[PDB]
Design a protein around this ligand. Structure first.
Ligand SMILES: CCCCCCCCO[C@@H]1O[C@H](CO)[C@@H](O)[C@H](O)[C@H]1O
Ligand SMILES: CCCCCCCCO[C@@H]1O[C@H](CO)[C@@H](O)[C@H](O)[C@H]1O
Ligand SMILES: CCCCCCCCO[C@@H]1O[C@H](CO)[C@@H](O)[C@H](O)[C@H]1O
Ligand SMILES: CCCCCCCCO[C@@H]1O[C@H](CO)[C@@H](O)[C@H](O)[C@H]1O
Ligand SMILES: CCCCCCCCO[C@@H]1O[C@H](CO)[C@@H](O)[C@H](O)[C@H]1O
Ligand SMILES: CCCCCCCCO[C@@H]1O[C@H](CO)[C@@H](O)[C@H](O)[C@H]1O
Ligand SMILES: CCCCCCCCO[C@@H]1O[C@H](CO)[C@@H](O)[C@H](O)[C@H]1O
Length: 496
């Protein structure tokens, strides 16, 4: 036997939680603003239907199939679906990807905590018109916290505050994970997910009331959701939608499979998975599209709305919005809520992105939950020093694991399960015990459409983003060693 989810609600709130921390409140509207505004819904909804939902259900079934046999991670689950030596090595990726993401994500999550503390106590720059006059003091503020050097220097010089807050952040993640699934992860989601919703609605209401001489939030929603179907001719818009889907549903990160391995043998996953995925989609379109960009376009105007979009999602949430809140009534408290929202949202994703390593140490190496959590914490905390001190090291990990990895591994899940294990055998496994059954239209979708989409996407990135700065070689060296480390642990699990 193993740990199990206590309630259907807690399972859904925990499953939906591991995608709200991926920054979709910033990620989605930026992608929508740069791919036809409201016309981006056609690629986004289709990618949500032809790629997201089928790959989501697939990850739910692979976890429950593995969890019934006591295996919450993919080095063992792949071996069940494909009795082969190549399947165990491919399974290492489903343990390597979430571990590498945690090595830099928890540190980023710690930024939101430290920024929430500084805003709460008022230790923020308070300017004083032009955007650079307002944005630059908060650019220095983030760069002084992270320790970004002034030039091409390879060394980061993070503040002691950022380091201490990172320690505190790791302590919070351990406190949730060391309690377990029901006592820890599920108890956290049932409380924080509703709190995130209430807190997000307040920001939405507070943003809709923004009025500056340069624009209104109505212009922000108008700019964000004005459709332009001329963009739909460009295949790049469809590339951005499918890749976006991997983040609204957290596909390929190894988190859905591990969380689903604690779903009991016959408990429903079809309806419970569709609800958690629908919760993810609506929460990022409504709440996410009503805060970040509307507040940005309202403050700077429609003239800078194009520049805000090209600036990117991360700059919007760590530079632009704090600078906007700085110039609004009660904005020091408003900035606290924004970073409090990002922290507690990210807290759902970090505990879920470290559970596969914990489940592996538990299921395959027979370690206690206490020792599995603390060893996982030690591996992540130690390795994060590479991200905290080496410039552009975060980017290198985010590229191999966060970008290419989840799309490559998502294609791997769909092939091992729906082709090698048997499509009919896989279809039985998904719809088994389902309160609602998957429509048979998704059979052709899972077997042909979704793998084709992921194959087209992988080649596009293999052509565009395949080709100085020797510090990335150190990062490549370290994450490759982590793969050798996990392969050795998988090997040690076979001997036991
Ligand atoms: C606590 C978590 C903070 C969430 C911030 C994530 C916002 C996403 O930000 C985007 O992420 C991409 C990679 O994922 C990068 O390539 C983009 O440059 C960046 O703008
Ligand atoms: C691998 C675990 C080792 C923990 C010790 C690492 C200490 C690095 O921490 C450093 O301590 C300095 C003290 O002034 C601070 O100025 C730096 O901001 C901080 O990065
Ligand atoms: C100054 C910041 C302190 C943060 C600590 C509280 C953060 C909220 O997190 C809580 O921490 C508790 C620690 O025991 C855990 O028991 C709870 O499970 C967890 O929800
Ligand atoms: C940030 C958006 C995602 C948060 C969604 C959490 C919504 C509250 O979550 C749950 O929804 C159920 C249906 O109303 C209620 O019965 C439960 O009391 C509540 O915990
Ligand atoms: C009493 C509860 C108030 C909820 C938050 C509202 C914050 C008010 O904020 C104010 O609202 C005005 C429009 O009414 C605008 O001029 C500005 O957005 C702002 O000055
Ligand atoms: C350096 C990585 C630490 C690995 C996790 C172990 C944390 C050490 O904690 C140990 O846990 C044991 C549990 O029985 C206790 O008996 C010990 O008193 C305690 O020191
Ligand atoms: C899982 C969330 C990933 C964190 C988002 C990345 C934020 C770190 O910073 C980002 O690094 C990127 C590297 O590609 C750059 O493209 C962005 O310009 C930069 O903002």
């Amino acid at each position: 036997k193993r740990e199990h989810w206590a309630t259907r609600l807690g399972l859904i709130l925990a499953m939906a939680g591991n995608a709200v921390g991926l920054g979709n409140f910033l990620r989605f509207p930026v992608q929508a603003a740069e791919n036809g505004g409201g016309a981006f819904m056609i690629p986004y909804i289709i990618a949500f239907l032809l790629v997201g939902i089928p790959l989501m259900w697939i990850e739910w079934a692979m976890g429950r199939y593995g969890g019934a046999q006591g295996h919450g991670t993919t080095p063992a689950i792949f071996y069940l679906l494909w009795r082969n030596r190549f399947a165990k090595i491919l399974g290492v990726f489903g343990l390597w990807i979430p571990l590498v993401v945690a090595i830099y994500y928890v540190y980023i999550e710690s930024w939101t905590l430290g920024f929430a503390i500084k805003f709460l106590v008022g230790l923020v720059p308070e300017p004083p018109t032009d955007p650079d006059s307002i944005l630059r003091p908060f650019k220095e503020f983030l760069y002084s916290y992270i320790g970004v050097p002034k030039g091409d220097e390879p060394i980061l010089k993070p503040s002691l505050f950022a380091y201490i807050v990172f320690l505190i952040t790791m302590f919070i993640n351990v406190s949730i994970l060391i309690r377990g699934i029901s006592k820890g992860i599920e108890r956290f989601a049932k409380i924080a997910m509703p709190t995130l919703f209430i807190l997000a609605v307040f920001l939405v209401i507070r943003v809709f009331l923004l009025e500056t001489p340069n624009g209104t939030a109505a212009d922000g929603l108008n700019f964000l959701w004005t459709p332009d179907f001329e963009k739909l001719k460009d295949p790049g818009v469809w590339i951005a939608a499918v890749g976006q889907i991997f983040f609204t549903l957290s596909l390929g990160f190894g988190a859905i499979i591990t969380y689903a391995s604690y779903v009991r043998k016959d408990q429903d996953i079809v309806l419970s998975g569709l609800t958690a995925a629908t919760l993810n989609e609506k929460a990022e379109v409504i709440l996410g599209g009503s805060i970040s960009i509307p507040a940005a376009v309202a403050f700077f105007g429609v003239a800078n709305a194009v520049a805000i979009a090209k600036a990117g999602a991360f700059n919007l949430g760590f530079i632009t919005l704090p600078a906007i809140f700085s110039q609004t009534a009660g904005g020091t408290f408003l900035g606290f809520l924004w970073f409090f929202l990002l922290f507690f949202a990210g807290l759902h994703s970090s505990i879920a992105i470290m559970q596969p390593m914990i489940a592996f140490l538990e299921d395959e190496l027979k370690l206690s939950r206490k020792h599995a959590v603390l060893w996982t914490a030690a591996i992540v905390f130690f390795s994060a020093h590479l991200v905290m001190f080496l410039n552009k090291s975060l980017d290198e990990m985010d590229f191999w694991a966060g970008t290419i990895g989840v799309v490559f591994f998502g294609l791997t899940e769909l092939i091992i399960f729906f082709w090698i294990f048997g499509a009919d055998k896989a279809w039985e496994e998904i719809n088994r015990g389902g309160i609602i059954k998957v429509p048979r239209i998704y059979y052709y979708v899972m077997r042909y459409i979704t793998p084709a989409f992921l194959a087209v996407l992988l080649v596009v990135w293999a052509r565009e983003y395949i080709p100085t700065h020797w510090t990335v070689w150190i990062t490549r060296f370290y994450i490759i060693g982590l793969f050798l480390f996990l392969t050795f642990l998988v090997f040690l699990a076979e001997r036991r």
